[PDB]
PDB file of all heavy atoms in Angstrom:
ATOM      1  N   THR A  93    -160.888  19.904  52.045  1.00 41.58           N
ATOM      2  CA  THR A  93    -160.163  18.639  52.150  1.00 41.58           C
ATOM      3  C   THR A  93    -161.137  17.481  52.069  1.00 41.58           C
ATOM      4  O   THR A  93    -162.337  17.662  52.263  1.00 41.58           O
ATOM      5  CB  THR A  93    -159.387  18.522  53.478  1.00 41.58           C
ATOM      6  OG1 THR A  93    -160.314  18.340  54.556  1.00 41.58           O
ATOM      7  CG2 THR A  93    -158.525  19.779  53.743  1.00 41.58           C
ATOM      8  N   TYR A  94    -160.620  16.290  51.790  1.00 42.04           N
ATOM      9  CA  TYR A  94    -161.454  15.095  51.659  1.00 42.04           C
ATOM     10  C   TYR A  94    -162.246  14.790  52.931  1.00 42.04           C
ATOM     11  O   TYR A  94    -163.472  14.590  52.884  1.00 42.04           O
ATOM     12  CB  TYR A  94    -160.573  13.892  51.267  1.00 42.04           C
ATOM     13  CG  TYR A  94    -161.317  12.597  51.004  1.00 42.04           C
ATOM     14  CD1 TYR A  94    -161.740  12.259  49.725  1.00 42.04           C
ATOM     15  CD2 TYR A  94    -161.589  11.707  52.036  1.00 42.04           C
ATOM     16  CE1 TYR A  94    -162.420  11.069  49.481  1.00 42.04           C
ATOM     17  CE2 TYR A  94    -162.264  10.511  51.800  1.00 42.04           C
ATOM     18  CZ  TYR A  94    -162.674  10.201  50.521  1.00 42.04           C
ATOM     19  OH  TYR A  94    -163.349   9.015  50.286  1.00 42.04           O
ATOM     20  N   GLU A  97    -164.955  17.387  53.482  1.00 41.34           N
ATOM     21  CA  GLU A  97    -166.006  17.280  52.458  1.00 41.34           C
ATOM     22  C   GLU A  97    -166.991  16.155  52.796  1.00 41.34           C
ATOM     23  O   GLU A  97    -168.196  16.257  52.516  1.00 41.34           O
ATOM     24  CB  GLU A  97    -165.374  17.067  51.069  1.00 41.34           C
ATOM     25  CG  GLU A  97    -166.364  16.984  49.893  1.00 41.34           C
ATOM     26  CD  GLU A  97    -167.059  18.310  49.583  1.00 41.34           C
ATOM     27  OE1 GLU A  97    -167.986  18.700  50.337  1.00 41.34           O
ATOM     28  OE2 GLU A  97    -166.694  18.952  48.567  1.00 41.34           O
ATOM     29  N   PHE A 102    -169.014  22.444  50.862  1.00 36.09           N
ATOM     30  CA  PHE A 102    -168.118  23.552  50.528  1.00 36.09           C
ATOM     31  C   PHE A 102    -168.533  24.146  49.197  1.00 36.09           C
ATOM     32  O   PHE A 102    -168.880  23.413  48.265  1.00 36.09           O
ATOM     33  CB  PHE A 102    -166.689  23.060  50.307  1.00 36.09           C
ATOM     34  CG  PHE A 102    -165.905  22.793  51.560  1.00 36.09           C
ATOM     35  CD1 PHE A 102    -165.702  21.491  51.989  1.00 36.09           C
ATOM     36  CD2 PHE A 102    -165.294  23.831  52.254  1.00 36.09           C
ATOM     37  CE1 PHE A 102    -164.941  21.221  53.120  1.00 36.09           C
ATOM     38  CE2 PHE A 102    -164.520  23.566  53.391  1.00 36.09           C
ATOM     39  CZ  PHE A 102    -164.352  22.261  53.819  1.00 36.09           C
ATOM     40  N   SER A 103    -168.430  25.464  49.088  1.00 33.56           N
ATOM     41  CA  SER A 103    -168.555  26.144  47.805  1.00 33.56           C
ATOM     42  C   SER A 103    -167.345  25.797  46.950  1.00 33.56           C
ATOM     43  O   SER A 103    -166.387  25.193  47.431  1.00 33.56           O
ATOM     44  CB  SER A 103    -168.562  27.655  48.029  1.00 33.56           C
ATOM     45  OG  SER A 103    -167.264  28.120  48.379  1.00 33.56           O
ATOM     46  N   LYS A 104    -167.380  26.170  45.675  1.00 33.83           N
ATOM     47  CA  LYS A 104    -166.163  26.138  44.879  1.00 33.83           C
ATOM     48  C   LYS A 104    -165.175  27.117  45.521  1.00 33.83           C
ATOM     49  O   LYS A 104    -165.595  28.051  46.225  1.00 33.83           O
ATOM     50  CB  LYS A 104    -166.464  26.533  43.429  1.00 33.83           C
ATOM     51  CG  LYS A 104    -167.450  25.606  42.720  1.00 33.83           C
ATOM     52  CD  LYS A 104    -166.979  24.170  42.723  1.00 33.83           C
ATOM     53  CE  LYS A 104    -167.784  23.312  41.732  1.00 33.83           C
ATOM     54  NZ  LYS A 104    -169.194  23.033  42.154  1.00 33.83           N
ATOM     55  N   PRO A 105    -163.866  26.902  45.308  1.00 36.24           N
ATOM     56  CA  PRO A 105    -162.860  27.715  46.012  1.00 36.24           C
ATOM     57  C   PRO A 105    -162.976  29.206  45.726  1.00 36.24           C
ATOM     58  O   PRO A 105    -163.238  29.578  44.577  1.00 36.24           O
ATOM     59  CB  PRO A 105    -161.527  27.226  45.435  1.00 36.24           C
ATOM     60  CG  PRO A 105    -161.806  25.911  44.796  1.00 36.24           C
ATOM     61  CD  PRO A 105    -163.261  25.886  44.427  1.00 36.24           C
ATOM     62  N   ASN A 235    -172.618  29.252  46.721  1.00 62.84           N
ATOM     63  CA  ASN A 235    -171.702  28.763  45.698  1.00 62.84           C
ATOM     64  C   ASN A 235    -171.785  29.621  44.429  1.00 62.84           C
ATOM     65  O   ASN A 235    -170.764  29.995  43.861  1.00 62.84           O
ATOM     66  CB  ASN A 235    -171.989  27.286  45.386  1.00 62.84           C
ATOM     67  CG  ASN A 235    -171.077  26.731  44.309  1.00 62.84           C
ATOM     68  OD1 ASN A 235    -169.866  26.646  44.505  1.00 62.84           O
ATOM     69  ND2 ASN A 235    -171.649  26.371  43.155  1.00 62.84           N
ATOM     70  N   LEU A 236    -173.000  29.951  43.993  1.00 61.51           N
ATOM     71  CA  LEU A 236    -173.159  30.811  42.818  1.00 61.51           C
ATOM     72  C   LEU A 236    -172.596  32.198  43.113  1.00 61.51           C
ATOM     73  O   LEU A 236    -171.955  32.815  42.255  1.00 61.51           O
ATOM     74  CB  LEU A 236    -174.630  30.905  42.392  1.00 61.51           C
ATOM     75  CG  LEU A 236    -175.246  29.644  41.783  1.00 61.51           C
ATOM     76  CD1 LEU A 236    -176.732  29.843  41.514  1.00 61.51           C
ATOM     77  CD2 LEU A 236    -174.522  29.248  40.500  1.00 61.51           C
ATOM     78  N   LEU A 239    -168.907  32.189  42.617  1.00 55.99           N
ATOM     79  CA  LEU A 239    -168.510  32.156  41.205  1.00 55.99           C
ATOM     80  C   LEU A 239    -168.725  33.512  40.550  1.00 55.99           C
ATOM     81  O   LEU A 239    -167.885  33.977  39.762  1.00 55.99           O
ATOM     82  CB  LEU A 239    -169.259  31.061  40.438  1.00 55.99           C
ATOM     83  CG  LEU A 239    -168.900  29.631  40.832  1.00 55.99           C
ATOM     84  CD1 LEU A 239    -169.754  28.626  40.077  1.00 55.99           C
ATOM     85  CD2 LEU A 239    -167.417  29.363  40.596  1.00 55.99           C
ATOM     86  N   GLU A 243    -165.803  35.934  38.942  1.00 55.64           N
ATOM     87  CA  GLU A 243    -165.833  36.373  37.546  1.00 55.64           C
ATOM     88  C   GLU A 243    -165.922  37.888  37.393  1.00 55.64           C
ATOM     89  O   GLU A 243    -165.496  38.437  36.371  1.00 55.64           O
ATOM     90  CB  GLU A 243    -166.985  35.678  36.808  1.00 55.64           C
ATOM     91  CG  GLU A 243    -166.704  34.190  36.605  1.00 55.64           C
ATOM     92  CD  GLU A 243    -167.868  33.415  36.019  1.00 55.64           C
ATOM     93  OE1 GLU A 243    -168.848  34.049  35.567  1.00 55.64           O
ATOM     94  OE2 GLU A 243    -167.789  32.160  36.015  1.00 55.64           O
TER      95      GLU A 243
ATOM     96  N   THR B  93    -167.686  27.772  35.504  1.00 23.96           N
ATOM     97  CA  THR B  93    -168.166  29.137  35.355  1.00 23.96           C
ATOM     98  C   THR B  93    -169.563  29.270  35.943  1.00 23.96           C
ATOM     99  O   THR B  93    -170.274  28.274  36.119  1.00 23.96           O
ATOM    100  CB  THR B  93    -168.232  29.576  33.870  1.00 23.96           C
ATOM    101  OG1 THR B  93    -169.213  28.785  33.182  1.00 23.96           O
ATOM    102  CG2 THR B  93    -166.868  29.428  33.170  1.00 23.96           C
ATOM    103  N   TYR B  94    -169.958  30.506  36.228  1.00 22.80           N
ATOM    104  CA  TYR B  94    -171.278  30.787  36.777  1.00 22.80           C
ATOM    105  C   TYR B  94    -172.404  30.276  35.868  1.00 22.80           C
ATOM    106  O   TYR B  94    -173.319  29.587  36.331  1.00 22.80           O
ATOM    107  CB  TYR B  94    -171.419  32.302  37.028  1.00 22.80           C
ATOM    108  CG  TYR B  94    -172.719  32.742  37.678  1.00 22.80           C
ATOM    109  CD1 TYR B  94    -172.787  32.971  39.046  1.00 22.80           C
ATOM    110  CD2 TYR B  94    -173.869  32.949  36.921  1.00 22.80           C
ATOM    111  CE1 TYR B  94    -173.963  33.379  39.650  1.00 22.80           C
ATOM    112  CE2 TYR B  94    -175.053  33.366  37.516  1.00 22.80           C
ATOM    113  CZ  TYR B  94    -175.091  33.578  38.882  1.00 22.80           C
ATOM    114  OH  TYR B  94    -176.262  33.991  39.488  1.00 22.80           O
ATOM    115  N   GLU B  97    -172.450  26.398  35.882  1.00 28.89           N
ATOM    116  CA  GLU B  97    -172.856  25.875  37.193  1.00 28.89           C
ATOM    117  C   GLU B  97    -174.369  25.926  37.363  1.00 28.89           C
ATOM    118  O   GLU B  97    -174.944  25.090  38.065  1.00 28.89           O
ATOM    119  CB  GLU B  97    -172.182  26.672  38.320  1.00 28.89           C
ATOM    120  CG  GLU B  97    -172.490  26.187  39.746  1.00 28.89           C
ATOM    121  CD  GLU B  97    -171.796  24.872  40.097  1.00 28.89           C
ATOM    122  OE1 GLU B  97    -172.287  23.792  39.689  1.00 28.89           O
ATOM    123  OE2 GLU B  97    -170.758  24.909  40.788  1.00 28.89           O
ATOM    124  N   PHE B 102    -170.557  20.438  38.957  1.00 24.61           N
ATOM    125  CA  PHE B 102    -169.107  20.397  38.810  1.00 24.61           C
ATOM    126  C   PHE B 102    -168.479  19.851  40.092  1.00 24.61           C
ATOM    127  O   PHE B 102    -168.910  20.205  41.194  1.00 24.61           O
ATOM    128  CB  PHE B 102    -168.544  21.813  38.631  1.00 24.61           C
ATOM    129  CG  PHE B 102    -168.604  22.347  37.224  1.00 24.61           C
ATOM    130  CD1 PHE B 102    -169.492  23.358  36.898  1.00 24.61           C
ATOM    131  CD2 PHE B 102    -167.721  21.889  36.250  1.00 24.61           C
ATOM    132  CE1 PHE B 102    -169.527  23.889  35.603  1.00 24.61           C
ATOM    133  CE2 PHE B 102    -167.744  22.409  34.973  1.00 24.61           C
ATOM    134  CZ  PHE B 102    -168.655  23.415  34.649  1.00 24.61           C
ATOM    135  N   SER B 103    -167.438  19.033  39.952  1.00 22.28           N
ATOM    136  CA  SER B 103    -166.621  18.636  41.094  1.00 22.28           C
ATOM    137  C   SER B 103    -165.818  19.847  41.534  1.00 22.28           C
ATOM    138  O   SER B 103    -165.740  20.835  40.807  1.00 22.28           O
ATOM    139  CB  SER B 103    -165.643  17.540  40.669  1.00 22.28           C
ATOM    140  OG  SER B 103    -164.605  18.090  39.865  1.00 22.28           O
ATOM    141  N   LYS B 104    -165.206  19.789  42.715  1.00 21.86           N
ATOM    142  CA  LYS B 104    -164.198  20.781  43.055  1.00 21.86           C
ATOM    143  C   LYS B 104    -163.114  20.709  41.967  1.00 21.86           C
ATOM    144  O   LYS B 104    -162.961  19.673  41.315  1.00 21.86           O
ATOM    145  CB  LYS B 104    -163.599  20.486  44.441  1.00 21.86           C
ATOM    146  CG  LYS B 104    -164.605  20.543  45.613  1.00 21.86           C
ATOM    147  CD  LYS B 104    -165.320  21.876  45.668  1.00 21.86           C
ATOM    148  CE  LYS B 104    -166.192  22.022  46.926  1.00 21.86           C
ATOM    149  NZ  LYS B 104    -167.314  21.053  47.043  1.00 21.86           N
ATOM    150  N   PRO B 105    -162.358  21.798  41.762  1.00 20.46           N
ATOM    151  CA  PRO B 105    -161.422  21.796  40.628  1.00 20.46           C
ATOM    152  C   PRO B 105    -160.284  20.782  40.751  1.00 20.46           C
ATOM    153  O   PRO B 105    -159.778  20.573  41.852  1.00 20.46           O
ATOM    154  CB  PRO B 105    -160.826  23.211  40.649  1.00 20.46           C
ATOM    155  CG  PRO B 105    -161.642  24.007  41.648  1.00 20.46           C
ATOM    156  CD  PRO B 105    -162.246  23.020  42.580  1.00 20.46           C
ATOM    157  N   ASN B 235    -166.670  13.799  42.977  1.00 64.30           N
ATOM    158  CA  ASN B 235    -166.092  14.924  43.702  1.00 64.30           C
ATOM    159  C   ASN B 235    -165.121  14.474  44.788  1.00 64.30           C
ATOM    160  O   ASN B 235    -164.030  15.042  44.939  1.00 64.30           O
ATOM    161  CB  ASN B 235    -167.194  15.767  44.329  1.00 64.30           C
ATOM    162  CG  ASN B 235    -166.639  16.939  45.088  1.00 64.30           C
ATOM    163  OD1 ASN B 235    -166.013  17.821  44.497  1.00 64.30           O
ATOM    164  ND2 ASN B 235    -166.833  16.951  46.408  1.00 64.30           N
ATOM    165  N   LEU B 236    -165.526  13.476  45.569  1.00 61.73           N
ATOM    166  CA  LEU B 236    -164.631  12.910  46.581  1.00 61.73           C
ATOM    167  C   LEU B 236    -163.404  12.257  45.946  1.00 61.73           C
ATOM    168  O   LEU B 236    -162.325  12.278  46.535  1.00 61.73           O
ATOM    169  CB  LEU B 236    -165.364  11.905  47.473  1.00 61.73           C
ATOM    170  CG  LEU B 236    -166.382  12.481  48.463  1.00 61.73           C
ATOM    171  CD1 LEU B 236    -167.092  11.356  49.172  1.00 61.73           C
ATOM    172  CD2 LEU B 236    -165.713  13.404  49.469  1.00 61.73           C
ATOM    173  N   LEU B 239    -160.849  15.032  45.155  1.00 59.73           N
ATOM    174  CA  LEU B 239    -160.173  15.471  46.377  1.00 59.73           C
ATOM    175  C   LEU B 239    -159.159  14.430  46.865  1.00 59.73           C
ATOM    176  O   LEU B 239    -158.066  14.779  47.299  1.00 59.73           O
ATOM    177  CB  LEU B 239    -161.198  15.778  47.469  1.00 59.73           C
ATOM    178  CG  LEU B 239    -162.084  16.997  47.174  1.00 59.73           C
ATOM    179  CD1 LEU B 239    -163.151  17.166  48.244  1.00 59.73           C
ATOM    180  CD2 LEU B 239    -161.234  18.234  47.091  1.00 59.73           C
ATOM    181  N   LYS B 240    -159.524  13.155  46.790  1.00 59.43           N
ATOM    182  CA  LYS B 240    -158.599  12.090  47.179  1.00 59.43           C
ATOM    183  C   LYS B 240    -157.358  12.078  46.279  1.00 59.43           C
ATOM    184  O   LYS B 240    -156.227  12.035  46.773  1.00 59.43           O
ATOM    185  CB  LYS B 240    -159.309  10.741  47.137  1.00 59.43           C
ATOM    186  CG  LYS B 240    -158.417   9.562  47.485  1.00 59.43           C
ATOM    187  CD  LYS B 240    -157.881   9.692  48.903  1.00 59.43           C
ATOM    188  CE  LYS B 240    -158.994   9.518  49.933  1.00 59.43           C
ATOM    189  NZ  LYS B 240    -159.643   8.182  49.806  1.00 59.43           N
ATOM    190  N   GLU B 243    -155.136  15.015  47.140  1.00 60.24           N
ATOM    191  CA  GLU B 243    -154.389  14.882  48.396  1.00 60.24           C
ATOM    192  C   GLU B 243    -153.301  13.800  48.345  1.00 60.24           C
ATOM    193  O   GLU B 243    -152.307  13.880  49.068  1.00 60.24           O
ATOM    194  CB  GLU B 243    -155.356  14.644  49.560  1.00 60.24           C
ATOM    195  CG  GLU B 243    -156.084  15.924  49.953  1.00 60.24           C
ATOM    196  CD  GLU B 243    -157.135  15.719  51.014  1.00 60.24           C
ATOM    197  OE1 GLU B 243    -157.135  14.658  51.685  1.00 60.24           O
ATOM    198  OE2 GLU B 243    -157.961  16.633  51.177  1.00 60.24           O
TER     199      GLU B 243
END
Side-chain angles (χ1 to χ4, degrees):
Chain A
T93 71
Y94 184 92
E97 182 69 284
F102 281 103
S103 73
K104 299 303 194 288
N235 179 64
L236 290 175
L239 292 177
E243 290 174 11
Chain B
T93 65
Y94 183 98
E97 182 73 280
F102 277 109
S103 73
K104 298 304 187 297
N235 180 64
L236 289 175
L239 293 175
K240 178 61 69 60
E243 285 175 16

